Design a protein around this motif. Sequence first.
Motif: not given
Lengths: 150, 150, 151, 50, 351, 50, 46
Positions: E244-246, A143-146, E237-239
Motif C-alpha cells: 500500500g505505497q506508491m 500520488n498525494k492521496f495514494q 506517474w505512480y502505482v
Amino acid sequence: ADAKTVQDTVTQVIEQNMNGIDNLMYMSSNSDSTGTVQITLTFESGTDADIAQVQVQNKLQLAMPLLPQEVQQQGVSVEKSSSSFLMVVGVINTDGTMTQEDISDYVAANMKDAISRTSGVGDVQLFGSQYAMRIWMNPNELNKFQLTPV
Amino acid sequence: IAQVQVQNKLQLAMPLLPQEVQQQGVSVEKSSSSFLMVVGVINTDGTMTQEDISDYVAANMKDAISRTSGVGDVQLFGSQYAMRIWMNPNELNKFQLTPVDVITAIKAQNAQVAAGQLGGTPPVKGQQLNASIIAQTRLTSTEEFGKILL
Amino acid sequence: KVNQDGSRVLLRDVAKIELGGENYDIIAEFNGQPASGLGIKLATGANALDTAAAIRAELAKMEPFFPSGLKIVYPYDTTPFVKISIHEVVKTLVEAIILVFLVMYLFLQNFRATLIPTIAVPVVLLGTFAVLAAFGFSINTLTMFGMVLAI
Amino acid sequence: TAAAIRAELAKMEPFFPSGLKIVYPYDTTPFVKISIHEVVKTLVEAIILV
Amino acid sequence: AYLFVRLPSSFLPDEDQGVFMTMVQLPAGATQERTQKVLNEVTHYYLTKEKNNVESVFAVNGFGFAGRGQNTGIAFVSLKDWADRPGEENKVEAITMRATRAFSQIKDAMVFAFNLPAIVELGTATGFDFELIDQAGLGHEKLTQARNQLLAEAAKHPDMLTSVRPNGLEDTPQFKIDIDQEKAQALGVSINDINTTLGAAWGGSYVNDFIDRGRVKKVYVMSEAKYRMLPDDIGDWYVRAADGQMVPFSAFSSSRWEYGSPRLERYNGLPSMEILGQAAPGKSTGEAMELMEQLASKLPTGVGYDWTGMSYQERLSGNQAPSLYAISLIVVFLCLAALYESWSIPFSVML
Amino acid sequence: WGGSYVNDFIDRGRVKKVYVMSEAKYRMLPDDIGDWYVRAADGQMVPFSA
Amino acid sequence: FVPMAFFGGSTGAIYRQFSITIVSAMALSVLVALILTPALCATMLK
C-alpha cells in the motif's frame, strides 16, 4: 493503441475471418497509429450492394468476440462507401460565439442523428466531436492521496 | 437471404453460449457436402511434417482460397501452428503450481497493450513532437515462451 | 477514499473535470472562423440528387430550434452542378429546334412546311424518356446529354 | 469456380520452399470437360451421318 | 490511320466543378499547432490574393485523405458562381495551377491542391496504382527495403519516364516503455495496474456512459496534457503496491527510442505497401505497367507484385474498342443486305 | 485433459493461437487423474482422488 | 450502337451510357417518323 498493435489485435483477426463471400476482387487495409483501421471489400460492378453489405458483416460477427473488450465497445461498423462527399454543411456561430468543442457537440446532439438515418446516406463524418465527461487526472495529486487511475 | 436470416437468430443466442465456445469459431455458410477439388500438397525434398505442411498450407494458401470464387467452406486437411504448451503435473507439483497459474501467467506476459502518445491530442501550445508509445508486445517465438516468469 | 483522519478525497480534488469533446484530433474553420460541418459521404448505389433533395429537408426542420448565432452555410455542394447540366442541355435543345426551324425556312420555306418536321422532334425525345424505364434499362443524366448527341 | 480456384493456387507456387509440390488426388473438372467432348463428337457424327 | 495514332487517349474530360480541394502533409511526428501554421498559410492565400474567385474555405486540421492524423490537413474551396469568373485564368484549371505553384514556391512542408476527377476514382487516364506484397512472410523492415529498392531503381528510368511515389510512409520514431516483468512482481505491483495506468493516463480510457440533457454520452479519463508531453513525464506517474505505497515508473520501466511505422497496409490478408506512379509523357499505361512488373520481379524473394484500382480490371478503350467496332462491323455489313441483297451495296455504304 | 485456449500470438507476421494441454504421458490413464494437484487457501498441494 | 453494350466494367456501362437511347431515339424516330410525318405531310402542305 499503436499501429502495430491494432494490426495484430484487430486487422488480422478480421481479415483471416473473411472466407466465402459471394463475389469480390480484393480487400485493402490501413491500421493507423491513431488506433483506427479500415478494411474495404471491393465487389464486382453489378453485385447487390445490399446483400454484399450483410455477408461481410456476418463474418465480422464471427471475429467480433476475438477482439479486445476495449475495441468492442468502441464502434465496429459495416457500411456502403463512395469516398466522395455530396454536401458539406458548415455550421458557424455569429453572435454569442460558442467553440469548436461547443458547436461540434450541438451539431451532433441535435442534427447528426436525424441525418445518416435519412435518405440513402452511407456514413456522415461529423467535423468535430460530441461532448463527453472529460476527467483530467493529476499524477501528483494522485500520488498525494495514494491513488492510481485504476 | 436464407444465409443471413439464420445468422441473425444465432446472433440472439450468441451471448448465451459459454465464453469458451464464443472465441472458438461460430459460423454460418452455404453447403453442398460434396467436394469439387482436393488439392494435395506433398513434400519431396527437405521433408517437412504433417504438422509442418498443414501449417504452411494454411498460413500461405488457405487464406487466399475460401475468400475467392464462390467457395462454401474449405476443409484444410491438418492444422495450422499454435504455441503448444505441454504441462508436467509433477513439475507443477514441485513448484506449487496449477494450470491456472500457467494460464494467468500467459495473458499477463504474452499481451498486446495500448498506451497513448507523447504530445497527446489536447496538447500544450508549444509542443514540438508527437510520437506514439509502445509498451508490451505480443511474443513471437518458442524461446520467448520458455522465459515466462511463474 | 476517506483516510485515517476523517478527510475526504473527491474527483474534483484529484482531477480537472470539464465538459469537452470526446476526442481532440480534428478541428475546422470556415474562412478562419471556428465552425463544425456535416460532411456527408454517399452510399454505394443510392441516388445522388434524390438524396440531396431530402438532406436539405432533414436539415430544414431543425433550424427554428437553433440558439443564438447558429447559422447554416454551404462550403461544398454538388447540387448546383447537376442542376446546371440540364439547363445547359435544354437551352442547347431549344436552340437545336429553332436552328432547324430556320434551315427548313431556308431550303423549302413557309411556316406551313416548317411545322411538320418540327412537330416530329419533341415526340421522339419525349417518348425516349418513357422507354428509359422499360423492361430493365436506365433513367439518368448524361443520358440526357447523349440525348443532344442524338438530337 | 474451379476455373479460378486453380488461378488462386497458381500465383503462390513461385514462393514455395524446398520440395513443396501440388498434386490432384480428387478433381471433378476433367469429367465435365469430357461431357462436352463426348457430345460435340456425337453432334458432328450426327451431321455427317445425315 | 496516322491521325488516329498521334492523337492521345483520355478517359473523361477533367471538367471544372465549381468546387475544388487542397491537401497538406507534414514531416515525421509533427504537431497540431505545426499543421495549423501551414493551414493558416493556405487559408490565407484564398481569402487574401484571390478574392474575386473563391467563395469560401472549409479548412480542416487533422483530417487527411488516405488517413487521418495530427500530421495532415485539407480545405474545401467553394468558388463564386460561374459567370463571375469569365476567363480561362479564372476557373479551376489555372486557379489550381496558381495554388500548386504558390504553395510549392516556398514551403517548409508539403501542400498540393487539386481538382475533382468528375467521378468516384478508378483510373485517371494513363497513371497507375502498384502494390508490393510480403509473400514469404519476411519482416516489415525487409518489405520497406524491397519497396525502397523498387522506388529507387525505377527512378533511374527517366528515359521512358515514370513518376513513382509511395503513400503514407513516414515510419516515425516511437517511444517504447519496457516494463521489467520480474522487478514489478518482486516489489509487489500488478501488471494489470501498470498497463491501465499507462493506458488511461496517456491514451485515455472509456469508462462508461452518462446522461447529458436527456442524451447518452461517453465518459473519458485521460489526464491533463501537462503531464504527457515529455518522456520524463512517464516517471512522474505512480502505482501503489501490495503493501500500500506508491512506486514510480522508472523504478521498473526501461525507456528507449525506436523506429516504427504509423500506417501499415495489408492486401488480401498479407502485409503490403501501396505504390502510386505515372505512365510517361510518351508511353502510356501498357509499357508503364509492364516495366513496373519486372522492376518488381528483379527484387528479393517473396516480394510478389499485384495491381489494384487503376489496374482496371479489364476495361479501358483498349480491349474494349477492338470488340466494340467488331460487332459494329459484322452487323453494319449484315442488315445492309436487308432489302438490299448482294455483296455490292455493303461496300456502297460500308466504306 | 481437454486443452485451453489462452490467447493469440504473432508467428512470422501472422496471428496464431496459444494452447496449453499437458503431455499425453499424463492423460492416457484414469490413474493419471490423481497425479494432478491443486493448491488450497493455506497454499499447499492437494491431489484429485482426495 | 447496341452492340456497344458488350462493354467493360469500371468504364462501367459508359459505352452503354448509350447505344440504347440513340437507338431509343432512332428506333423511336423510325417509328414516330414512320407513323407520323407521312400523316402530317398529308394534312398540311401546298
